[PDB]
Ligand binder design. Sequence first.
Ligand SMILES: *[C@@H]1O[C@H](CO)[C@@H](O[C@@H]2O[C@H](CO)[C@@H](O)[C@H](O)[C@H]2NC(C)=O)[C@H](O)[C@H]1NC(C)=O
Ligand SMILES: *[C@@H]1O[C@H](CO)[C@@H](O[C@@H]2O[C@H](CO)[C@@H](O)[C@H](O)[C@H]2NC(C)=O)[C@H](O)[C@H]1NC(C)=O
Ligand SMILES: *[C@@H]1O[C@H](CO)[C@@H](O)[C@H](O)[C@H]1NC(C)=O
Lengths: 99, 99, 49, 148, 148, 209, 214
Amino acid sequence: RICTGITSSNSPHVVKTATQGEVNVTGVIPLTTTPTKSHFANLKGTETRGKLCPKCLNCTDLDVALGRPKCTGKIPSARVSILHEVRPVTSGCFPIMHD
Amino acid sequence: DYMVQKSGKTGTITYQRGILLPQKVWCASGRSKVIKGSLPLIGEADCLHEKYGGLNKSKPYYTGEHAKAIGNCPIWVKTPLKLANGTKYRPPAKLLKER
Amino acid sequence: KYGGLNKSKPYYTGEHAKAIGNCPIWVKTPLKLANGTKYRPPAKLLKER
Amino acid sequence: IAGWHGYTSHGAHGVAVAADLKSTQEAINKITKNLNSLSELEVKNLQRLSGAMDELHNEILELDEKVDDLRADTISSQIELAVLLSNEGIINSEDEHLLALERKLKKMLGPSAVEIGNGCFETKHKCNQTCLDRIAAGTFDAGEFSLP
Amino acid sequence: IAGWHGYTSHGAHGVAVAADLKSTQEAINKITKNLNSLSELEVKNLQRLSGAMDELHNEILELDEKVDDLRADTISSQIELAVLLSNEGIINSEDEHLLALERKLKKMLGPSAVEIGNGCFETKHKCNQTCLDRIAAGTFDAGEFSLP
Amino acid sequence: SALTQPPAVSGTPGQRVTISCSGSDSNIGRRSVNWYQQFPGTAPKLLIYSNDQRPSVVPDRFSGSKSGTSASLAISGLQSEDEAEYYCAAWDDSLKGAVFGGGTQLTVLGQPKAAPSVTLFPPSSEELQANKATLVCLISDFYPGAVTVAWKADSSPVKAGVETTTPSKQSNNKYAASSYLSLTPEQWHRSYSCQVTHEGSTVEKTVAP
Amino acid sequence: VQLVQSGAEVKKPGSSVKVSCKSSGGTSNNYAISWVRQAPGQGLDWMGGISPIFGSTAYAQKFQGRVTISADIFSNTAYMELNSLTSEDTAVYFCARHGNYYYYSGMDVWGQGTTVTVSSASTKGPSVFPLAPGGTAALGCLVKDYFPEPVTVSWNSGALTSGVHTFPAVLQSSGLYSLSSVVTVPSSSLGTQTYICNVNHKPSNTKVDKRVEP
Ligand SMILES: *[C@@H]1O[C@H](CO)[C@@H](O[C@@H]2O[C@H](CO)[C@@H](O)[C@H](O)[C@H]2NC(C)=O)[C@H](O)[C@H]1NC(C)=O
Ligand SMILES: *[C@@H]1O[C@H](CO)[C@@H](O[C@@H]2O[C@H](CO)[C@@H](O)[C@H](O)[C@H]2NC(C)=O)[C@H](O)[C@H]1NC(C)=O
Ligand SMILES: *[C@@H]1O[C@H](CO)[C@@H](O)[C@H](O)[C@H]1NC(C)=O
């Protein structure tokens, strides 16, 4: 007695189709995950601008933007940048009434 | 304050006493891709995501909080999609019936 | 455009506009769901009355 | 006159008619699942910008209107395809059911009958209501009339 | 216990099992082509406007958020349909393969056997592993046991 | 009506009881019979369908059969909770509509005498302010379900303003009733008493203004 | 699935009524639904039915011409409209779903039941009066002088339902019936749990909440 047929895991897994609705299948591959939160990072394949002038130590972006003394120096080009201050602050020099 | 001068155009300033006259000015070109994030940047990642931070594309799609992102990123989807990897159902036939 | 309306059917045709709540969805043409069998203007597998 | 899927009988008793309840129902359920699915699509609505004021922000409001207009069109096309796909699945399920009805008219009433290839058969025996009702009920035995 | 597509054998030797490599593989390849295709969809990402500043351009930023929100939804629906269509094609390829396996179990083991219409057959001869392995290898000849 | 069933059947706990349903060729003859069970004041439930098929929630002690233009429901191993009204039903091909029997009441013998619990509430202050007074006598958990109530107005009985309900059976298969005394606030004497006599014995309660 | 029939109705003879069914937790559109009434002390009686996807509406001969049955497939709702009303029509209406698309199968699910009272007079919302109360105690809500039937009693926004015994109503010679309820709970449950008695009355749209202190 020789049969052809298809062997299965004999367990149901619902998938959806365009015209036939739900169908039970012997296996599935999940195509999604739910990610979890962690720190930001450099983007692989790029130079990522965080600070405008990371070699300018003890300077903020606004400090650099105003040309505060000791906060000058080359600003690296970047195709990708991270906005880390919604309200950039100074950290030295002559007092400003910012707002 | 600052004023932006575009495409080679001249700006003007009117002033009285106490004027801080412009000296060095910023010269900028091109466009960077910007998203919100926080410093410091730790290591590297395939993808930077506004809500999840740095993440690696483990699967082609993700569920969760959609947000702005840059790089080689999974694509947001509403439901946990599943690819078929199997044969149909058939809770199983007795074309033999033994053990 | 229509003011207050009740979702009598899942879709509507007409003037698209901003709206809030539990609303029918705007569509370009009067869509129709099949509710039947095929055609077959009819066979004489008997032919009588 | 109920039924949607069913059977006929010619012969000397004139013509006679009976309905296959399960085949009728499954065709029905296929249509109702599609209707429910199309009735439960979730699409977000469109409102005004809260921050953009008339007169002050006319340029932004023009763009807002533009985003809405293109969105409506896209969703309309997206919904239209869903209906077209539903109709595809419903119409295809018809052929599955009909073919399954022929294989049932071939399992019953035995080899003594001959198939027209029409969904219709020519039987040796008489039929009429009661005999046709048993075909519809799936309890018809050929051996009633001493047949194979 | 390998295989996905394959054959069985009852008889006096108890039950026995063997796998059709090509039919198994082609089913597989169909799934892997779909996975690759779905893994290589290209969709552009969304970032901030470079020109729009917080506090100054809040009205524009609200609209920007709105464009993003509607876009995510549209792409989600678009991707979802792609998966549903993939699953459709994979499931349909199953029936093509099974039907092709029956026509192969009908080409081999000759007219001496009788088809149950079950994907299964009743053979005159004994089978067991070796005889079933040749059915799986496509080298089985009926004439081994002097048969048609 | 169309299908006919006996108005009453009875039995003792654990006995087998049967209920018949006679029809005609135009109903039972050519169509399937269904049976329903109904408890008082609630909607009917399906007990049997397609002649001989039970729902999963229905106990197997219930069975049905059909012969000719007649049908029958049998209940093996009777329990006290099976006391209820029963209806048969079928489609009729002549009337082109569904028909029902007149219903059969099944009674389960075997229930214990129970003396009545009585509670008697005096008129509320709120009601007096609205220039009415109602004495509320609530009678519960008695069996057999026959009670007679007397209202004692000091020690004479009152000839008017007494209204008493019929006995309704409880969830615990015993019975309940209630009686209302309506009086002007002026009439609301030093003592009023509700007297409930049940099988000779009399239960009493009293309230004082 | 659960099917919720509409509220209680009070109608003048000759007017009509409409009774809507609603099924919750799934559609019933792929099944037949029938309407069945029960006069007081009387048996079940088929009015007609509907099978909304099939496209069929059927009627009992005894009601032909006077009853209209309908459905809204988009809201998963069925309706029954009965015209030319008469005291003879005063009874409990029942809707039920069948096992299939047609009226042959045995109706396995039903409504809680609609009761419609016909007559020629204005109605009345009753006052709520409450009774005051070991092992266990008893306490009662006294619902006086209403017309007509029915009323519902609720205790503790329906969370309480243990030992709740809503007594039948006694029709006074005046026309209005009284109703009361008795609920039993333990004795010590006295000074920690406040009981709340709500007595709906749809015909007059009444809805008073009464609390009652020992
Ligand atoms: C995403 O993958 C990258 C590698 O592609 C991870 O970067 C590594 O980080 C850890 C600790 O910082 C170390 O293994 C290496 O310093 C990094 N490897 C490379 C090749 O740079 C990164 O950690 C991953 N991100 C997450 C959230 O898991
Ligand atoms: C779904 O299709 C059915 C047909 O199968 C429709 O019912 C028909 O209604 C029209 C006019 O009312 C007539 O052709 C027949 O009286 C009905 N057919 C049957 C078999 O009873 C039904 O109306 C359709 N549904 C909707 C919402 O239009
Ligand atoms: C799929 O499997 C479920 C049980 O997991 C079953 O209830 C359902 O009927 C199956 N689908 C089909 C189409 O038979």
